[PDB]
Structure 1
Amino acid sequence: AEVTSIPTGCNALSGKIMSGFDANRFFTGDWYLTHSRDSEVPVRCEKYQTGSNLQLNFNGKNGDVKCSGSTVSGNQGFYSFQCTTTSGGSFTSYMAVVETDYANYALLYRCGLYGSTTPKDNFLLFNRQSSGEIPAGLSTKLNQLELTSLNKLGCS
């Protein structure tokens, strides 16, 4: 059966997502994951490569990861990505773009179960440049979401 809403425990962020999200402008080019609310060690620099039809590739923890996306019918703005890893792993992950200017930065929410019963989520800051940091345009939004000290990752 089709999965029609994000996992129980994931935040649908009703009322907190940008209006007029343009998938065509977001899912093009490269995005570097430069900061996140929660982070692991050692920090890394993941470059997310996008292609047509919600396909993406990134350099993950242990090998390249390839994902295929689709819209989540019950949750506006959300996507479900089915991913496979070069070590032979597979997982599902959910995301929504909270705010983006398409040409410089994007604040995303990500959530998934990953085989557990308790979801793991995060807020992610993507930048078009590996040297990208926290944009002035997100100041108020980050305050509203209580994201006052994003962790810098391994990009520079």
Structure 2
Amino acid sequence: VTSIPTGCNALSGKIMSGFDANRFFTGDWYLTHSRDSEVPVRCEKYQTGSNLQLNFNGKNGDVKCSGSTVSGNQGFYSFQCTTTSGGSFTSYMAVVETDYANYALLYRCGLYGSTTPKDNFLLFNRQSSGEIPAGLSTKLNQLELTSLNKLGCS
């Protein structure tokens, strides 16, 4: 995979340097806040594994994803995901900024056919009780993500 779909923001100049994929893809993350949210809110727990694995409890059952680097868009991964209800889809994600030990801001792009129909920014927290962290305030102000929605974790 060389580039992200049209409709997906490349985030030029916005992604952290020195990303350590191994430290991000270890341990659990809770999706505590997001730019866009649907009713009813949920608590999605993401589990990680070696070779860019990302699982979570999705709307329609458990989702299991395997990632691949996107060479032309630094920081982006293409995830191939399957679900227990028989779904199969591709999702692009980039870790915009993380401290590994507490929080990570992610950008996500969907895929339908060859284009991205919808995107979102996701706040991952190591604790289900996590806040919008002070440690992201510079980046959130830069991206004008200043009212992230609280989801269903606590």
Shorter chain as denominator, the TM-score bin is: over 0.9
Percent identical? 100
Tell whether the 8 Å contact from 1:7 to 1:119 is kept in structure 2 after alignment: no
CA–CA distance in structure 1, aligned partners of residues 115 and 2 of structure 2? 18
Find 1:47's aligned residue among 31, 45, 48: 45
Count of residue pairs brought into register by the alignment: 154
Q: CA deviation at 1:36?
A: 0.3
Distance 1:130 1:25, change over 3 A: same
Q: CA deviation at 1:6?
A: 0.5
Q: CA deviation at 1:74?
A: 1.2
Tell whether the 8 Å contact from 2:109 to 2:116 is kept in structure 1 after alignment: no
Distance 1:29 1:36, change over 3 A: same
Q: Deviations over 1:88-146 (max 9, x none)?
A: 01100001011100000000000022358552101110000000011111112111101
Distance 1:26 1:118, change over 3 A: closer
Report the TM-score, using the length of structure 1 for normalisation.
0.95
CA–CA distance in structure 2, aligned partners of residues 111 and 118 of structure 1? 6
Q: Does 1:58 align with 2:56?
A: yes
Which segments of structure 1 move beyond 6 Å, counting only runs of 4 or more? none
Q: CA deviation at 1:55?
A: 1.3
CA–CA distance in structure 2, aligned partners of residues 79 and 113 of structure 1? 13
CA–CA distance in structure 1, aligned partners of residues 74 and 105 of structure 2? 16
Please, what is the CA RMSD of the aligned residues? 1.2
List runs of 5+ in structure 1 lacking aligned partners: none
Tell whether the 8 Å contact from 2:5 to 2:114 is kept in structure 1 after alignment: no
Tell whether the 8 Å contact from 2:42 to 2:151 is kept in structure 1 after alignment: yes
Tell whether the 8 Å contact from 1:109 to 1:124 is kept in structure 2 after alignment: yes
Tell whether the 8 Å contact from 1:93 to 1:112 is kept in structure 2 after alignment: yes
Tell whether the 8 Å contact from 2:65 to 2:80 is kept in structure 1 after alignment: yes
CA–CA distance in structure 2, aligned partners of residues 108 and 118 of structure 1? 16
Q: Deviations over 1:21-42 (max 9, x none)?
A: 1101111000000000001111
Report the TM-score, using the length of structure 2 for normalisation.
0.96
CA–CA distance in structure 2, aligned partners of residues 48 and 142 of structure 1? 22
Who is 2:150 aligned against?
Answer: 152
List runs of 5+ in structure 2 lacking aligned partners: none
